C-alpha cells in the first residue's frame, strides 16, 4: 500500500477539500470524530482506504491532508466545523493577510515567508508513509494564493520529492462565479510556472459547474456549497481507484500512463453523469447506455468545449454502481455509430473501463439524489484547448494596455514574466493544434 | 435591444442583413471586437468558435456552422461522400483526390477500364485553375486537387446550344431545419457547347466571371447570363413537356437533404452553449436525361442581384428573429 | 482586518461624525458603545471599525483631528459624541484659515506628530492592520493641507498599507472662500501620489441632488452630509458585513485601479432620499443614472474602466444579475472593451436604516476628468493674475509649487482622456 | 471490438476495450525569491528617499 497526500491551497482549494473529505468519510464509514467501526485493525492497517487516512492508537482515522491559506477566515471554519475532530492543528495552516488576488503577492512576497513552514508540515506527513506515491493539489487558477503560492509549492515539491507524482485539481475562472478582474493574469502566470511540475491536471470550469447546478439541480443561484459538493462527486469518482480495491488507476503514476501520452498535454477533460436533483419527486433511473451517451454531451463536461472538433488521445470510463462489462460494451458500440469520436493516428481507438460496485454516495440533505449507477469519463481531448484560447485572449486584451501590471511589478515580479508566461501558453495552444487539427 | 457585430465586411449577403437589422430599430451594431453581442456575422477563415457562448446572460448566435467546411471544400466533399455510409452514390460524379490519402492508382484503374471499354474518358481537375482533358497524363502533369468525370452530355438550352449550371440557396437554422429558397438561378454559357474543343474554357465553364470576360456574346439570351426559375420552368414545359419541379427539383431537394443530414451529428448546435445557422450555395449539373448532378457546395455564397432583398429578409425572419423575436419564401425539406 | 479611521478639519469631522452614527446603528452599537443588535451579522466583522473594551464596549477606531477646537467640541456634544475614545481627539487652537499652506507647512506641521502618536497607538493594537481611511475636504485648510500632510507621513511610516480617502471637492455653488481652487489643486497633487483609492465627493453634485432631485430649495451642509453618510455606509458595506467573497481594501484597489494614478472613483447611491420599496430594475436604472452620481460628471462623456455595485436588502439575486447584465449588455459603448468583466456585483442581506433595499455604485470612469478640468479652470483664472497668492507666499510657498501642482493635475486629465480613446 | 485485461474483485472490475488499433534547483528557486525581494526593497527605498526629500 502506497500513501497519497492531499494539499489544498487558497479559499477554493480549502472549501473544495472540505467537501471531498466530508464525502470520503461518508463513503468509507468514518464518523466526524475520526472513528471507523467497520475497521477491525485498530490503530493500523494497510487497506485501500489507508492511502488517504492514517490511524492513531485510539482508533481515529486522520486524513493525509494539508490545508494552507494566506488568511485564516476559511480554514478557521474547518477548525470549528463539523469535522474539526478529524484533522489535527498542524494540518491546518493559515497566515494573516492574503495575496489580494495577486499572483506576484502570493508567489514572491508572502510565499517566501511561509513556504518553508508548509513544506515542513508536509514533510511530517511524508515521514508517516511507508511508500509515498505523490500529491493531489487543489487550488483555484484565479486566486492570488491558489495561483501564486501553488506554483511555488509545486516547484519545491519537485525538489524535495523528485520521484513522486503530482496531480492537480484546478478551478478555472468563470465570471458567473465571483471572479476578480485579474484572474486571467493569475491563470496564465500559474499555468506557465506549474506546467513542468504537474503530471496530470483536472481543470474544472466554474461556468460548467454553475450551469449544471442551474440546469440539472434547478438551483437558481448556486452557492459555493452547491458547487463544491458537485465538484467533490467528480473528485471522488477520480480518486475512488486509489481508495478502494481495484485494478485500474491504482496509483498516481497510472494516471499519466493512461491519460497523458505527451507531458505538456496533461489536462484531461472530465464528464459526469447523471446529475439528478434530490428535490425531484418522481425520477426514472438512467441506464448504462444512457449515462455513457451523456458522457459525450458538452452540457455534462467540467469544461465547456466541443470534442467533436478535436481528437482523442486517451479515454477512461469510471463507473460506480450497478454496472456490468456487458452493458458497457453494448453502449459503447452504439455510441460509436452515432457519435463523432476521432482518435489521433498514433493512439489506439479504445476505452479503459473501471467499475466500482458501490453506487455514488451523496451527502444527506444535499442537492444530489442517490442514483443506482453513475460514470465519470476522463478523455484527453484537444478540444480542451478552447479554454486556453479563451483565457489567453482575455489576457491579451488587458496586457496590450498593461492594465493592472503595476500591481505585480510592485510585488517584485518583472514585467518580462508576463510575456514569458504568455509565450508558453502560445506554444501550448500550438501543441494542441498540431496534435488534433488537419490542415 | 439586440446587439450584433460584423467581422466580414466583404459579405454582400450579410451587409444587407446587417442593414436590415438596423431598420428594425430593435438591433444595435457593436464594434467588431466587443464580446457582448447576441449575433455574430463572423469571418470566413479561423472564426473563433471557442470563444462563443461563454458570456453570462447572453444568448449568442453565429452565422456559420463549425465543421461545415467538410461539405464546402472540394477535396473534403469527395472524401465525405466516399467514407460516409449514408452516402457511399448516384448523384455525385466519380471523383478522386490527387495530391501533387492519394488515389492515383485507383483513379488510373478506372481510367484504363473506360479507355479499353470505348467509353468517354474525359475528366476535369479542379481545386479550392481548371483543366479539362481526356488524357490522364495531361491532367496529372498540370496538378504537379480533385479529378472528376466531366459530364460530356449536359442538358443544352435552345436556342444557343449552350451549357449551364443551377445555383440553389439553402438556409439551415439553429434547429437544423433545412430551408430551400424557392428562387434559384441558372448560370448560362453564352457560347454554344463544343464537345471537340476542351481547350477553350468558355462554353464549358459556367462561372459568371468567365462569361462576363471571355464570352463575346455575353448577355445575348438572358440578362447577365442568369435565367430564373419561372423562365426555365416554362422552357421545360414548351421544349420537353415537363416541369422544373418534377424533372429537377425533386432530385435537388433529395441531394440537399442527403448532404446536410449526413453531417448533422457532427455540426449540430442542439445542445451546445452557442447556436449556429448558415446559408449554403449548392451547385448542380443537369444532363440530357434530366438527371441532376451535385458539383460543389459553397459555404459563403453570394446572391443574385434581384434576389438579395427577398432572401436577406428571409434570413432575418427564419434564422435571426426566430432566436431574438422582435416587437413563406422557403421550402422546408 | 482592522481599518484606522481619520477625520480632519471641519468638513472631515462633520462627515466623519455622521458616518460613525450611521454604521453604529447598522451594527447595533448605541451612543454609549453598547451592542443591542438582534443579528450575528452585525458583530461578525465589527472589529474592522471598532475596538472591544471591558464590558463588551465597542469603541470606533477613529482619530479626530483639527487645528481649531470648534467643530470637534460639536462632535463631542453630538448624539454619539461619548462613543469616541477621548484620547483620540487631537486639536490645536490657531486654525488654518482656509489656507493649504497653513495646514500643510506651518500650523499643521506643529500638530502632526501628536496625530501620528495616536495613529501609532491604534495600529499597534491591530491584529493585522488593513489600511487607513481619511475623511476631509479639499477646499479648506486643515482637511486639505494638514490632511494630505498626514497621508504623506502615514505612508512614510506604513508604506505597505492601503490609503483610502473620502475627499469632498469644492464648488462655487457651495463655496466658503475663493481660494478653494488653490487648496483643491494643491491637494489633488498629493492624492494622485499618496492614496490608493479616493472617493471623489463633489459638493456641486450634492447640491444639485438636493435642489433638483430632493426638491430642497435651500440645501444646508446637513442636507449635503445626509447624502455623504449614506454613500459612505454603502461603499463600506462589503468591508463591514459577511459576504460570499471576503473583500478588503487591497482587493478593492487591485480590481478597481488598472493604473496607479487613475484611482479616483465616482460614487453613486439609490434610492435618493417614502414607503414604497423599489424594484430591482428601478435600483439598477437609478444607480447608473447621472443624477445619482456624487461627482458632477456625465458618465456618457467618458468610459468606465471598472465598476463595483453593492445591493443591500432582501431581493432576488437572480433578478440582480439579470438587471446588472442588462445594463452592461445594452450600454456596451460606455465600458472599455479591453478589461473583460470589469463590472462586479455584490449583495448584502442587511439593508440600511429606513430602506428595504438600496444600491451603491462605485465607478472608475474617465468622465471624472470633468471634475479636475473644472477645478483646473478655476485655478488658472486666478493664478494667471497671481490673485490671492500672498496668503500662500506669506507662509513660505513660492509660485513654482503652484505651477507644479497645476501641471500634475493637467497631466492627470490627459491620462484619463488617453484611456477614454483606447 | 476486443475486450482485454479483465480483472474482477468483490468490489468491482476493470478491463480495456479496443475498437481500432493505432527542473529548477533549490538554489535557483531561492535566488528567484530573493531577487524579487531586492526589487521590492529598491522600490521602497526610492519611495522613502522621495518622501525624505
Ligand atoms: N468552485 C469553487 N470556486 C471557488 C471557490 N472559492 C473561490 N473560488 C474561485 O476561485 C477564484 C478566486 O480564488 P480564491 O481561492 O478565492 O483566492 P485565494 O486562493 O484564496 O487567494 P487570495 O487572493 O489570497 O484570497 C474565483 O474564480 C472563484 O470563483 C469555491 O469554494 N468553489
Ligand atoms: N464534372 C463536371 N461536368 C461538367 N461540368 C463541370 C464539371 N465540373 C465542373 N464543371 C464546370 O466548371 C464550373 C466550375 O467548376 P467549380 O466546381 O470549380 O465551380 P467554382 O468553384 O470554380 C465557382 P462556383 O462557387 O460558382 O461553383 C461549373 O460551373 C461547371 O460548369
Ligand atoms: C471591478 O471589479 C471589482 C470591484 C470590487 C471588488 C472586486 C472586483 N472584481 C473583487 O473581487 O473584490 C472587490 C469586492 C468589493 C466590492 C464592492 C466594494 C468593495 C469591495 O471590496 C472590499 O469595497 C467597496 O465596495 C464588490 C465585489 N467584491 C467582492
Ligand atoms: N459636504 C460638506 N462640505 C463641507 C462641510 N463643511 C465644509 N465643507 C466644504 O469644505 C470646504 C471648506 O473646508 P473646511 O472643511 O470647512 O476647512 P478646514 O476645517 O480647514 O478643513 C468648502 O468647499 C466647503 O464647501 C460639510 O459639512 N459637508
Ligand atoms: Ca485499520
Ligand atoms: Mg483567499
Ligand atoms: Mg464554390
Ligand atoms: Mg470651514
- The residue whose grid cell reads 434547429 is B175
A and B interact (at least 3 Cβ pairs within 8 A)? yes
Q: Which residues does ligand 3 sit against, CB inside 6 Å?
A: A 180-181; C 235, 238-239, 245, 247-248, 251-252, 255-256, 306-308, 310, 342, 344, 346, 362
Pairing of strands B292-298, B162-172: unpaired
Question: Could A247 and D9 be called an inter-chain contact, meaning their C-beta atoms sit closer than 8 Å?
Answer: yes
C and B interact (at least 3 Cβ pairs within 8 A)? yes
Q: Where are the domains of chain A?
A: 1-268, 269-383, 384-439
Which residues have C-beta under 5 Å from ligand 5, the single-atom ion? Answer: A 39, 41, 45
Which chain D residues are closer than 8 Å to C156 by Cβ? Answer: 48, 51
Q: Which of B85, B42, B75 is nearest to B61 (CA)?
A: B42
Atom of ligand 1 nearest to the CA of A69: 20
Burial-class residue A140 by CB neighbours within 10 Å (0-12, 13-18, 19+): buried
Chains sharing 3 or more CB pairs under 8 A with chain A: B, C, D
- Cell of residue C406, nine digits: 497645476
Taken in order A71, A74, A76, A79, is the CA torsion positive or negative? negative
- The residue whose grid cell reads 462527486 is A233
User: Which of A197, A245, A332 lies at the smallest CB-CB distance from D23?
Assistant: A197
Taken in order C344, C345, C346, C351, is the CA torsion positive or negative? positive
Is A71 one of the annotated binding-site residues?
A: yes
Question: Could C156 and D44 be called an inter-chain contact, meaning their C-beta atoms sit closer than 8 Å?
Answer: no
- The residue whose grid cell reads 449544471 is A212
Question: Could A336 and D19 be called an inter-chain contact, meaning their C-beta atoms sit closer than 8 Å?
Answer: yes
Which residues have C-beta under 5 Å from ligand 7, the single-atom ion? Answer: B 296, 298
Contact residues, chain C to chain B, C-beta under 8 Å:
321-322, 325-326, 328-330, 332-333, 337, 340
Q: Distance between CA B172 and CA B332 in Å, rounded? A: 10
Cβ B169 vs Cβ B184: under 8 Å:
yes
Pocket test for ligand 4, best of C6, C7, C9, C11 (most atoms within 8 A of CB): C11
Taken in order A246, A251, A254, A255, is the CA torsion positive or negative? positive
Closest ligand to Cα B302 = 2
Pairing of strands A3-9, C264-270: unpaired
SS3 sequence, chain B?
CEEEEECCCCCHHHHHHHHHHHHCCCEEECCCCCCCCCEEECCCCCCCHHHCCCCCCCCCEECCCCCCHHHHCHHHHHHHHHHCCCCCCCCCCCEEECCCCCCHHHHHHHHHHHHHCCCCCCEEEECCCCEEECCHHHHHHHHCCEEEECCCCECCECCCCEEEEEEEEEEECCCCCEEEECCCEEEEEEEECCCCCCCCCCCCCCCHHHHHHCCCCCCCCCHHHEEEHHHHHHHHHHHHCCCHHHHHHHHHHHHHHHHHHHHHHHHCCCCCCCEECEEEEEEEEEECCCCEEEEEEECCCCCCHHHHHHHHHHHHHHHHCCCCCCCCCEEEC
Cβ C261 vs Cβ C409: under 8 Å:
no
Is C418 one of the annotated binding-site residues?
A: no
Question: Could C254 and A394 be called an inter-chain contact, meaning their C-beta atoms sit closer than 8 Å?
Answer: no
Cβ C89 vs Cβ C66: under 8 Å:
no
Pairing of strands B2-6, B27-29: parallel
Domains present along chain B, CATH in parentheses:
2-62 (3.40.50.11480), 68-72+155-332 (3.30.470.20)
Q: Does C401 touch chain D (CB under 8 A)?
A: no
- Cell of residue B287, nine digits: 444532363
Question: Could C251 and A100 be called an inter-chain contact, meaning their C-beta atoms sit closer than 8 Å?
Answer: yes
Atom of ligand 4 nearest to the CA of C137: 10
> Residue A227 contacts by C-beta under 8 Å, 6 or more apart in sequence?
A177, A206, A209, A210, A213
Neighbours of A44 (CB within 10 A): 12
Cβ B229 vs Cβ B151: under 8 Å:
no
Mutate to test the interface with D, among A412, A415, A420, A421 (most CBs of D within 10 A): A412
Pairing of strands D12-20, D2-9: antiparallel
Closest ligand to Cα A14 = 1
Is A179 one of the annotated binding-site residues?
A: yes
A329 membership: H or E segment, kind and range: helix A325-338
What does the angle CA C191 – CA C195 – CA C198 come to, to the nearest 5 degrees? 80
Q: Does C155 touch chain D (CB under 8 A)?
A: yes
Report how this structure was experimentally obtained: X-ray
Q: Where are the domains of chain C?
A: 1-258, 259-367, 368-422
Q: Distance between CA A56 and CA A34 in Å, rounded? A: 10
Q: Distance between CA C18 and CA C233 in Å, rounded? A: 10
CA C87 to ligand 7 center in whole angstroms: 86
Q: Which of C272, C357, C345, C259 is nearest to C309 (CA)?
A: C345
- Cell of residue A259, nine digits: 491519460
Q: Which of B31, C328, C254, B35 is nearest to A393 (CA)?
A: B35
Q: Which residues does ligand 2 sit against, CB inside 6 Å?
A: B 93, 124, 126, 148-151, 165, 205-207, 283, 285, 295-296, 298
Give one DSSP letter per residue of C245-304, joined into a string.
S---HHHHHHHH-SSTT--EEEEEEES-----PPPHHHHHHHHTSGGGBSS---GGGS-E
Between helices D26-52 and C147-157, what is the axis angle to 10°? 150
Q: Distance between CA A228 and CA A212 in Å, rounded? A: 12
Q: Distance between CA A220 and CA A367 in Å, rounded? A: 13
Closest ligand to Cα A232 = 1
Neighbours of A54 (CB within 10 A): 17
Q: Is the peptide bond before B43 cis (omega within 30 degrees of 0)?
A: no
Burial-class residue A222 by CB neighbours within 10 Å (0-12, 13-18, 19+): buried
Pocket test for ligand 1, best of A143, A180, A221, A231 (most atoms within 8 A of CB): A143
CB C180 less than 6 A from any atom of ligand 4? yes
Cβ C201 vs Cβ C169: under 8 Å:
yes
- The residue whose grid cell reads 493512461 is A258
Q: Which of A303, A356, A349, A364 is nearest to A325 (CA)?
A: A356
- Cell of residue C229, nine digits: 453618510
SS3 C366: helix
Taken in order C145, C150, C156, C158, is the CA torsion positive or negative? negative
User: Which of C325, C330, C337 lies at the smallest CB-CB distance from B56?
Assistant: C325
How does DSSP classify residue A139?
E
Burial-class residue A23 by CB neighbours within 10 Å (0-12, 13-18, 19+): buried
What does the angle CA A324 – CA A327 – CA A332 come to, to the nearest 5 degrees? 125
Q: Distance between CA C154 and CA C132 in Å, rounded? A: 9
Q: Distance between CA A200 and CA A384 in Å, rounded? A: 14
- Residues of A acting as catalytic residues: 254
Q: Which of A126, A147, A252, A271 is nearest to A200 (CA)?
A: A252
User: Which of C325, C328, C337 lies at the smallest CB-CB distance from B33?
Assistant: C337
Give one DSSP letter per residue of A143-170, joined into a string.
SIIIIIIHHHHHHHHHHHSTTSEEEEEE
Amino acid at each position: 500500500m502506497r500513501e497519497c497526500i492531499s494539499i489544498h491551497v487558497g479559499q477554493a482549494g480549502v472549501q473544495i477539500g472540505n467537501a471531498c473529505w466530508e464525502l470520503y468519510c461518508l463513503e468509507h464509514g468514518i464518523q466526524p470524530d475520526g472513528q471507523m467501526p467497520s475497521d477491525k485493525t485498530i490503530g493500523g492497517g494497510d487497506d485501500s482506504f489507508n492511502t488517504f487516512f492514517s490511524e492513531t492508537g485510539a482508533g481515529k482515522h486522520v486524513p493525509r491532508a494539508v490545508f494552507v491559506d494566506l488568511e485564516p477566515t476559511v480554514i478557521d471554519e474547518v477548525r470549528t466545523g463539523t469535522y474539526r475532530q478529524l484533522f489535527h492543528p498542524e494540518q491546518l495552516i493559515t497566515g494573516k493577510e492574503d495575496a489580494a488576488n495577486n499572483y506576484a503577492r502570493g508567489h514572491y512576497t508572502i510565499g517566501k515567508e511561509i513556504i518553508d513552514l508548509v513544506l515542513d508540515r508536509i514533510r511530517k506527513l511524508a515521514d508517516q508513509c511507508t511508500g509515498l506515491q505523490g500529491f493531489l493539489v487543489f487550488h483555484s487558477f484565479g486566486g492570488g494564493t491558489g495561483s501564486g503560492f501553488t506554483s511555488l509549492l509545486m516547484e519545491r515539491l519537485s525538489v524535495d520529492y523528485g520521484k513522486k507524482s503530482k496531480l492537480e485539481f484546478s478551478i478555472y475562472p468563470a465570471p458567473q462565479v465571483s471572479t476578480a478582474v485579474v484572474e486571467p493574469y493569475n491563470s496564465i502566470l500559474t499555468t506557465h510556472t506549474t506546467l513542468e511540475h504537474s503530471d496530470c491536471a483536472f481543470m474544472v470550469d466554474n461556468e460548467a459547474i454553475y450551469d449544471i447546478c442551474r440546469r440539472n439541480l434547478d438551483i437558481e443561484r448556486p452557492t459555493y456549497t452547491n458547487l463544491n459538493r458537485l465538484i467533490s462527486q467528480i473528485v471522488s469518482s477520480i480518486t475512488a481507484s486509489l481508495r478502494f480495491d481495484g485494478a485500474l488507476n491504482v496509483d498516481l503514476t497510472e494516471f499519466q500512463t493512461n491519460l497523458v501520452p505527451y507531458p505538456r498535454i496533461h489536462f484531461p477533460l472530465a464528464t459526469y453523469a447523471p446529475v439528478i436533483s434530490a428535490e425531484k419527486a418522481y425520477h426514472e433511473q438512467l441506464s448504462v447506455a444512457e449515462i455513457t451517451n451523456a458522457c459525450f454531451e458538452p452540457a455534462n463536461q467540467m469544461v465547456k468545449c466541443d470534442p467533436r472538433h478535436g481528437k482523442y488521445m486517451a479515454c477512461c470510463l469510471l463507473y460506480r454502481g450497478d454496472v456490468v462489462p456487458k452493458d458497457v460494451n453494448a453502449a459503447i458500440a452504439t455510441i460509436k455509430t452515432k457519435r463523432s469520436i476521432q482518435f489521433v493516428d498514433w493512439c489506439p481507438t479504445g476505452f479503459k473501463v473501471g467499475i466500482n460496485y458501490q453506487p455514488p454516495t451523496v451527502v444527506p440533505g444535499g442537492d444530489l439524489a442517490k442514483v443506482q449507477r453513475a460514470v465519470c469519463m476522463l478523455s484527453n481531448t484537444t478540444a480542451i484547448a478552447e479554454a486556453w484560447a479563451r483565457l489567453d485572449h482575455k489576457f491579451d486584451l488587458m496586457y496590450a494596455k498593461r492594465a493592472f501590471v503595476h500591481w505585480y511589478v510592485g510585488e517584485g515580479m518583472e514585467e518580462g514574466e508576463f510575456s514569458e508566461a504568455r509565450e508558453d501558453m502560445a506554444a501550448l495552444e500550438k501543441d494542441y493544434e498540431e496534435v488534433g487539427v488537419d490542415s | 435591444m439586440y446587439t450584433f457585430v460584423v467581422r466580414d465586411e466583404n459579405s454582400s449577403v450579410y451587409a444587407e442583413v446587417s442593414r436590415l437589422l438596423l431598420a428594425t430599430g430593435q438591433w444595435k451594431r457593436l464594434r467588431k471586437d466587443n464580446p457582448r453581442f447576441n449575433l455574430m456575422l463572423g469571418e470566413r477563415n479561423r472564426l473563433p468558435f471557442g470563444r462563443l457562448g461563454h458570456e453570462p446572460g447572453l444568448v449568442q448566435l453565429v452565422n456559420y456552422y463549425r465543421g461545415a467546411d467538410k461539405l464546402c471544400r472540394k477535396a473534403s466533399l469527395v472524401k465525405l461522400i466516399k467514407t460516409s455510409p449514408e452516402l457511399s452514390c448516384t448523384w455525385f460524379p466519380e471523383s478522386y483526390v490527387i495530391y501533387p490519402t492519394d488515389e492515383r492508382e485507383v483513379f488510373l484503374a478506372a481510367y484504363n477500364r473506360r479507355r479499353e471499354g470505348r467509353e468517354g474518358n474525359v475528366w476535369i481537375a479542379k481545386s479550392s485553375g481548371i483543366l479539362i482533358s481526356s488524357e490522364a497524363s495531361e491532367l496529372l502533369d498540370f496538378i504537379d486537387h480533385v479529378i472528376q468525370k466531366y459530364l460530356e452530355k449536359p442538358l443544352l438550352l435552345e436556342p444557343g446550344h449552350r451549357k449551364f449550371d443551377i445555383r440553389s440557396w439553402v438556409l439551415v437554422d439553429h434547429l437544423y431545419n433545412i430551408y430551400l429558397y424557392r428562387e434559384g438561378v441558372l448560370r448560362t454559357s453564352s457560347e454554344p457547347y463544343n464537345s471537340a474543343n476542351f481547350q477553350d474554357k468558355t462554353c464549358h465553364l459556367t462561372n459568371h466571371c468567365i462569361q462576363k470576360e471571355y464570352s463575346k456574346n455575353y448577355g445575348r439570351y438572358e440578362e447577365g447570363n442568369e435565367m430564373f426559375f419561372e423562365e426555365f420552368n416554362q422552357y421545360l414545359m414548351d421544349a420537353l413537356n415537363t416541369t422544373l419541379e418534377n424533372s429537377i427539383l425533386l432530385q435537388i431537394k433529395h441531394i440537399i437533404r442527403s448532404c446536410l443530414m449526413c453531417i448533422e451529428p457532427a455540426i449540430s448546435t442542439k445542445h451546445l452553449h452557442y447556436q449556429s445557422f448558415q446559408l449554403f450555395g449548392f451547385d448542380f449539373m443537369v444532363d440530357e436525361e434530366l438527371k441532376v448532378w451535385l458539383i460543389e457546395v459553397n459555404g459563403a455564397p453570394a446572391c443574385a442581384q434581384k434576389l438579395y432583398a427577398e432572401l436577406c429578409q428571409g434570413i432575418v425572419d427564419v434564422a435571426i428573429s426566430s432566436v431574438f423575436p422582435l416587437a413563406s419564401i422557403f421550402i422546408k425539406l | 482586518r482592522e481599518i484606522v479611521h481619520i477625520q480632519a478639519g471641519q468638513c472631515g469631522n462633520q462627515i466623519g461624525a455622521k458616518f460613525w452614527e450611521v454604521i453604529s446603528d447598522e451594527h447595533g452599537i448605541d451612543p454609549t458603545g453598547s451592542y443591542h443588535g438582534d443579528s450575528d451579522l452585525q458583530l461578525e466583522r465589527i472589529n474592522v471599525y471598532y475596538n472591544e473594551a471591558t464590558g463588551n464596549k465597542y469603541v470606533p477606531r477613529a482619530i479626530l483631528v483639527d487645528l481649531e477646537p470648534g467643530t470637534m467640541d460639536s462632535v463631542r456634544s453630538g448624539p454619539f459624541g461619548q462613543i469616541f475614545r477621548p484620547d483620540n481627539f487631537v486639536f490645536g487652537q490657531s486654525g488654518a484659515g482656509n489656507n493649504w499652506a497653513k495646514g500643510h507647512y506651518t500650523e499643521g506641521a506643529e500638530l502632526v506628530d501628536s496625530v501620528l502618536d495616536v495613529v501609532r497607538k491604534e495600529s499597534e493594537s491591530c491584529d493585522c492592520l488593513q489600511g487607513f481611511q481619511l475623511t476631509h475636504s479639499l477646499g479648506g485648510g486643515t482637511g486639505s493641507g494638514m490632511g494630505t500632510l498626514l497621508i504623506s507621513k502615514i505612508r512614510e511610516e506604513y508604506p505597505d498599507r492601503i490609503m483610502n480617502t473620502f475627499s469632498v471637492m469644492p464648488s462655487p455653488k457651495v463655496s466658503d472662500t475663493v481660494v478653494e481652487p488653490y487648496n483643491a489643486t494643491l491637494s489633488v497633487h498629493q492624492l494622485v501620489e499618496n492614496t490608493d483609492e479616493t472617493y471623489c465627493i463633489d459638493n456641486e453634485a450634492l447640491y444639485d441632488i438636493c435642489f433638483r432631485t430632493l426638491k430642497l430649495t435651500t440645501p444646508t451642509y446637513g442636507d449635503l452630509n445626509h447624502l455623504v453618510s449614506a454613500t459612505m455606509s454603502g461603499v463600506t458595506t462589503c468591508l463591514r458585513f459577511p459576504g460570499q467573497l471576503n473583500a478588503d481594501l487591497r482587493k478593492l484597489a487591485v480590481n478597481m485601479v488598472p493604473f496607479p494614478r487613475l484611482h479616483f472613483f465616482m460614487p453613486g447611491f439609490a434610492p435618493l432620499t417614502q414607503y414604497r420599496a423599489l424594484t430591482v430594475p428601478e435600483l439598477t436604472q437609478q444607480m447608473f443614472d447621472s443624477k445619482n452620481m456624487m461627482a458632477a460628471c456625465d458618465p456618457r462623456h467618458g468610459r468606465y474602466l471598472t465598476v463595483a455595485a453593492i445591493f443591500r436588502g432582501r431581493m432576488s439575486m437572480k433578478e440582480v444579475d439579470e438587471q446588472m447584465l442588462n445594463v452592461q449588455n445594452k450600454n456596451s459603448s460606455y465600458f472599455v472593451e479591453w478589461i473583460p468583466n470589469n463590472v462586479k456585483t455584490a449583495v448584502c442581506d442587511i439593508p440600511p436604516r429606513g430602506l428595504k433595499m438600496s444600491a451603491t455604485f462605485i465607478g472608475n470612469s474617465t468622465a471624472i476628468q470633468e471634475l479636475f478640468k473644472r477645478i483646473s479652470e478655476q485655478f488658472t483664472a486666478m493664478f494667471r493674475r497671481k490673485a490671492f497668492l500672498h496668503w500662500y507666499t506669506g507662509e513660505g510657498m513660492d509660485e513654482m509649487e503652484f505651477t507644479e501642482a497645476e501641471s500634475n493635475m493637467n497631466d492627470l486629465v490627459s491620462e484619463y482622456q488617453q484611456y477614454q480613446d483606447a | 471490438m476486443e475486450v482485454i485485461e479483465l480483472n474482477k474483485c468483490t468490489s468491482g472490475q476493470s478491463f480495456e476495450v479496443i475498437l481500432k488499433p493505432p527542473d529548477p534547483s533549490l538554489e535557483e528557486i531561492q535566488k528567484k525569491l530573493e531577487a524579487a525581494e531586492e526589487r521590492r526593497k529598491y522600490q521602497e527605498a526610492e519611495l522613502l528617499k522621495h518622501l525624505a526629500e
